[PDB]
Design a binder for this molecule. Structure first.
Ligand SMILES: Nc1ncnc2c1ncn2[C@@H]1O[C@H](COP(=O)(O)OP(=O)(O)OP(=O)(O)O)[C@@H](O)[C@H]1O
Ligand SMILES: [Mg+2]
Length: 519
RNA sequence: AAAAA
């Protein structure tokens, strides 16, 4: 049993004391809501039934539009595969379902963003929709029967996709567009990770703990330059390979030690990187300057191997490492009977730890869908601002928080919209925004539900200075950069973007939870 | 072609 590219660090098995801490770890995971209910799971499976119905109808309808016979259009098939954390079996109650739609050659992504998009919109169950056709991997994001779904589409080079099709055959990848290869590899990567760990259930528990920890410590969000689900999965998988007989609790301790001691940017790799024909691009820092720039590379096992942490910046690297060091101290303390699992999973203090914050607000006076598009675009560029800021001589760190803050306002007139852009983002002025603000208290209320809305999504970057530092160049670049995608958001009567420098004590109330109090 | 699954 060779798992991975080296032998194990240790084949020593778990002691009674370690197994006791493993039992306690699992109980803390349960208490903290790591595992969804049976009903919640049933709800996911029901969505998957509908998505398959839609996928096949999608392929049939496209086929017919391309003048194929009734019988041939049916034979074209189409199917779905899960991928991501639900397929891996480490999802929680709040996790999305990642769904890959596999379609034959005559069905393209333009079809996906027109016909399949159309089919989703017919559904009474559709709560939200935000198509993102221009992304490294194009996606339709939806909320369906209250469940977040991520939908991507891979076009195979064959006339038919039978329901029985599997993705094991590497021949299926021949000559495929880069975007489709990435799509198919969502599913293939999950399956290979499970193949590459000595004890899948030890791996699953350890990963559930790392997902909870990373969420709590605010080091989980691919979009903002932190590792996402697959990067965290592969990191845990590597530790599992190195300690094949350890319990999950011990894997956590070793995870923090090994990854804090790791000689970054040496890559984390789960299996020898497969060579392909010269037509196919594989992660290789010797050939590609871009790959050489990856700060903490975590490489997917599925051919062709890619880096799952391209978005990591100098600042987010420093934060991840700080958190690993904390993990070492706390897990050691847990194993020496001084601390609890609860201590490890304690919430971050992002909004207490810096003197200064840069506040980024995307405004939309329009539909919820328009706001999802605009705010999604802006959110996707925040890491670019982080990178521009962190290279400025006077900046010690530019630390992005991992989730936007959403709010909406009743906004009957053009003048009201201009007022909202004035008063928001400062605790000094934020009380004046009410009572236009929508709350879970009065949202049911006919006047509130019926009113035109202005929507806000606000992101924060924590700032620490090497010292006033002039930050106008990165900020102005960012403002202008977002505007040009392309002319879709140039209308200032509907879309706006504002950046605000804010000191810690003037941070909005939204930022602090019930248990917490303003500095 | 500034890597939103
Ligand atoms: N940056 C990336 N590099 C490589 N593959 C990725 C990347 N981001 C997403 N994926 C693929 O898409 C899948 C789903 O992405 P998603 O962001 O939903 O993460 P996940 O693993 O499902 O975890 P969770 O949804 O619980 O946060 C991943 O598991 C992975 O296979
Ligand atoms: Mg997911």
């Amino acid at each position: 049993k060779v798992f991975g590219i080296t032998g194990p660090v240790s084949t020593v098995g778990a002691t009674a004391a370690e197994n006791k801490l493993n039992d306690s770890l699992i109980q803390e995971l349960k208490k903290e809501g790591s595992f969804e209910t049976e009903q919640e799971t049933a709800n996911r499976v029901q969505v998957l039934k509908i998505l398959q119905e839609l996928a096949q109808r999608f392929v049939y309808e496209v086929s017919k539009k391309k003048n194929m016979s009734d019988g041939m259009a049916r034979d074209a098939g189409g199917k779905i595969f899960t991928y991501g954390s639900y397929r891996l079996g480490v999802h929680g109650p709040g996790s999305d379902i990642d769904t890959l739609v596999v379609v034959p050659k005559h069905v393209t992504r333009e079809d996906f963003f027109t016909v399949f998009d159309s089919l989703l919109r017919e559904r009474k169950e559709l709560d939200e929709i935000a198509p993102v056709p221009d992304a490294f991997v194009p996606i339709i994001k939806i909320k369906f029967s209250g469940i977040s779904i991520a939908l991507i589409c891979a076009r195979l080079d064959q006339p038919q996709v039978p329901l029985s099709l599997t993705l094991s055959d590497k021949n299926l990848l021949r000559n495929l567009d880069e975007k489709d290869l990435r799509a198919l590899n969502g599913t293939r990567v999950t399956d290979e990770i499970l193949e590459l760990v000595p004890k899948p259930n030890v791996f699953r528990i350890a990963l559930r703990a790392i997902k909870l920890w990373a969420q709590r410590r605010a080091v989980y969000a691919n979009i903002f330059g932190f590792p996402g689900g697959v990067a965290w999965a592969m990191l845990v998988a590597r530790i599992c390979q190195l300690y094949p007989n350890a319990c999950s609790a011990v894997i956590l301790n070793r995870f923090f030690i090994i990854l804090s001691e790791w000689n970054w940017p040496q890559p984390v790799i789960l299996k020898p990187i497969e060579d392909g024909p010269l037509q196919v691009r594989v992660w290789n820092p010797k050939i590609y300057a871009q790959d050489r720039s990856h700060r903490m590379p975590v490489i997917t096992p599925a051919y062709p191997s890619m880096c799952a942490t391209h978005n990591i910046t100098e600042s987010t690297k420093k934060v991840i490492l700080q958190e690993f060091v904390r993990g070492v101290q706390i897990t050691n303390d847990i194993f020496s009977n001084k601390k609890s699992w609860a201590n490890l999973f304690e919430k971050n203090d992002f909004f207490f730890r810096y003197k200064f914050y840069l506040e980024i607000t995307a405004y939309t006076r329009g539909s919820d869908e328009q706001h999802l598009k605009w705010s999604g675009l802006v959110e996707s560029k925040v890491r670019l601002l982080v990178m521009k800021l962190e290279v400025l001589a006077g900046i010690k760190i530019a630390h992005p928080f991992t989730k936007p803050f959403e709010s909406s306002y009743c906004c009957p007139t053009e003048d009201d919209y201009e007022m909202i852009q004035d008063k928001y983002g400062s605790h000094k002025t934020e009380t004046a925004l009410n009572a236009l603000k929508l709350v879970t208290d009065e949202n049911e209320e006919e006047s509130i539900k019926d009113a035109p809305k202005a929507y806000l999504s606000t992101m924060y970057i924590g700032l620490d200075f090497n010292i006033k530092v002039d930050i106008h160049i990165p900020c102005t670049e960012f403002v202008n950069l977002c505007r040009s995608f392309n002319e879709d958001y140039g209308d200032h009567k509907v879309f706006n973007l504002a950046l605000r420098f804010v000191k810690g004590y003037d941070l909005p109330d939204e930022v602090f939870d019930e248990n917490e109090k303003r500095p």
